[PDB]
Design a protein around this ligand. Structure first.
Ligand SMILES: CS(=O)(=O)c1ccc([C@@H](O)C2[C@H](O)CCC[C@H]2O)c(Cl)c1OCCC1OCCO1
Ligand SMILES: CS(=O)(=O)c1ccc([C@@H](O)C2[C@H](O)CCC[C@H]2O)c(Cl)c1OCCC1OCCO1
Ligand SMILES: [Co+2]
Ligand SMILES: [Co+2]
Lengths: 386, 386
């Protein structure tokens, strides 16, 4: 059921901002690893004495990487005279965030009808304010409320190209990389306590619970009216033999934070071929592939959706497959993006639920916890028996 | 003249350590941009709860990238029980260094006969101690003294493979990249006052002044007995029309620090072809090339060393050329390695001074300050006149 209870008009995911020690090196690594183009910048060369911010894009996916300069460069500025292009940025907040959590997502940004109204309604309904609505060049409004941990939900609204003060990148520095990624599908947080986190976020957004279909986790998914903004949240489950991976996350991250970003590809086979070719030459590594038994079991589970050849291509690339009552999902996960075993990326492509494709078609892959465990058990038994 | 006055036995440059916010992303960017292989690691997977350190190598060049984990992971350790593989590492020092200076070189490491004796002799002769000699696994000794700013000169000596506690990298993660770089030629510091810096470093090393052959700088070069360890130092010159680039460095770096690393290539043409192909797909950018007049003037300056075709290849790749009374130098410079206009890299190859090739053959390219200025003037006059 979808009660369509959004308290303000939400459009789509807009961008994700990483807070970095050095934005240049992270942005260049991510560009090559994910096939995203350098599309905009705000830094010393554009008159920003406060922070360096670089924007990568692939289709509608926008990744922003931001790091602070020495405060001495802007020591004479005040907020009314700032050269920062992102008015919510603060040197101390950014250094403290990065010291505490390491490389990770500071902002999950959604485009809304009116960021000032979204902010006001959110705070009136319990949201903890983080940055008030600020109008940039009478053209774009940006505001921020706390989401979980030190992650903020950022609202952006446009009167009518990323943000004023950003310059498009001269095409010599903009190599047109593209491995097929096209948009952010969902963004997932890890929290110590799921219940209060859900009550808080659903309380101030009106987002509803998205319908779902040992593990070490409990999870639930909040969704916007058209279910195109999807925000799963996990908590750890204490009491099992293999330690909860969510708890390990919270320890290494110093608390709640963004766990994974799921990036929709329009051709997950091409995306994974391209990303895997680059894993050991500066790109991203992937989780170890499931055993051949997992792909043997795929035929019985999705043989009506995927041909034998398409299943064998999934096996070549290590792709996981899960299925709903309405759709089928192809997914795969990277190893952690940085030094700490915290944030990682998921590549996903969904088949079915055609109307456009409805949001969340096929679910989030919860069935693969069981299917993976099952397939490993079968594989070890096959090996021992042979 | 070479008085050969080293106060202890110095062998060669050993490694350069960068202090990072996230070592993984910087190391992966540098690996792809410079063609260096991942060769060793010390991190959570090797039992190090304190810092993540990744070693890249190309020939004898060794770049180490280190970042701190959350202090909470090691909060119960003391130095006698540490899981750090680099005993001089400190969470607070590393965060403070990076907050102050951004991404840059913390340690210039030279291999010596006996690091404990080198440390003792250095401090007895004025060196400010930074980390005392520590013997690792009865096999390697490491010690550190202050060089300039927050850069240390690190001594390493081996009884008899990088450092105990580091693990060789499984060849699946070790792609055998190689663009031709083979060793560190020189490492250059920017300081506010050259005189005292030289007196200090030459005071405690016994290094002698290496013989040299508007600019905004004064510079001098300290050298070990066989002139294979080369440490140029620059100070700003105030009073000119175009602001001293050394002063700009000191402002953005919050003081003295390492300005550039010069990496010797065994085939500078191949190195630059490979690095330039990757500039816009995650690698390093280069300074704008000199005008065609510079390469027209090359024929009159080095036509006896380089054929017309070799000169045209220099022009294709933007390579600069300078000449001594003893040798010729091919060189080119990157744009800054990170967000701040501070540290950059030089690629160099030297021809002549055969005995082995003597250190510093051809100088450091000081003649290119004049030759570049001259050639730009000629080019603008050609364009206006045509
Ligand atoms: C074992 S799994 O079936 O690989 C698998 C399936 C689905 C999802 C996610 O996308 C899900 C979704 O977005 C929200 C709901 C819950 C969440 O779990 C993951 Cl995070 C996942 O774990 C991958 C990394 C990890 O590496 C070691 C073990 O797993
Ligand atoms: C104009 S230059 O002739 O490109 C040139 C020639 C030689 C050297 C160095 O290696 C030299 C050496 O190691 C030690 C002695 C002095 C030092 O200067 C440089 Cl740093 C250099 O500037 C490059 C970057 C900068 O970018 C904008 C202007 O220059
Ligand atoms: Co997911
Ligand atoms: Co140089």
């Amino acid at each position: 059921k979808n009660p369509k209870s959004d308290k303000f008009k939400v459009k789509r995911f807009h961008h994700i901002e990483f807070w970095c020690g050095d934005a240049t090196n992270v942005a260049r690594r991510f560009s090559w690893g994910l096939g995203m183009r350098f599309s905009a910048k705000s830094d010393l060369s554009t008159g920003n004495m406060v922070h360096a911010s670089y924007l990568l894009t692939s289709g509608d996916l926008r990744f922003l990487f931001t790091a602070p300069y020495s405060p001495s460069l802007s020591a004479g500025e005040i907020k009314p005279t700032t050269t920062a292009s992102i008015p919510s940025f603060d040197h101390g907040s950014c250094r403290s965030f990065f010291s505490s959590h390491g490389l990770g997502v500071r902002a999950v940004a959604i485009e809304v009808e009116d960021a000032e109204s979204a902010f006001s309604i959110s705070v009136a309904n319990g949201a903890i304010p983080s940055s008030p609505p600020i109008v940039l060049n009478e053209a774009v409004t940006i505001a921020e409320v706390k989401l979980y941990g030190d992650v903020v939900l950022r609202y952006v609204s446009y009167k009518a190209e990323f943000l004023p003060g950003f310059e498009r990148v001269e095409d010599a520095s903009s190599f047109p990389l593209d491995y097929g990624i096209r948009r952010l599908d969902h963004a997932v947080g890890n929290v110590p306590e799921l219940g209060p986190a859900l009550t808080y976020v659903a309380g101030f957004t009106g987002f509803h619970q998205f319908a779902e279909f040992e593990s070490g986790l409990n999870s639930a998914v909040l969704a916007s009216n058209d279910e195109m903004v999807l925000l799963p949240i996990n908590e750890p489950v204490h009491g099992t033999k293999r330690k909860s991976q969510i708890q390990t996350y919270l320890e290494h991250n110093e608390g709640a934070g963004l766990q994974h970003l799921a990036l929709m590809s329009e051709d997950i086979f091409r995306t994974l071929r391209e990303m895997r070719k680059r894993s050991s030459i500066g790109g991203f590594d992937f989780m170890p592939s499931p055993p051949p038994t997992y792909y043997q079991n795929l035929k019985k589970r999705v043989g009506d959706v995927l041909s034998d050849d398409q299943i064998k291509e999934c096996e070549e690339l290590g792709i996981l497959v899960d299925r709903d009552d309405q759709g089928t999902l192809l997914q795969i996960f990277t190893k952690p993006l940085g030094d700490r075993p915290t944030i990682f990326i998921e590549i996903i492509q969904r088949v079915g639920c055609m109307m456009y494709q409805s949001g969340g078609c096929g679910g989030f892959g919860k069935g693969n916890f069981s299917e993976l465990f099952k397939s490993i058990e079968e594989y070890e038994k096959t090996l021992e028996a042979k």
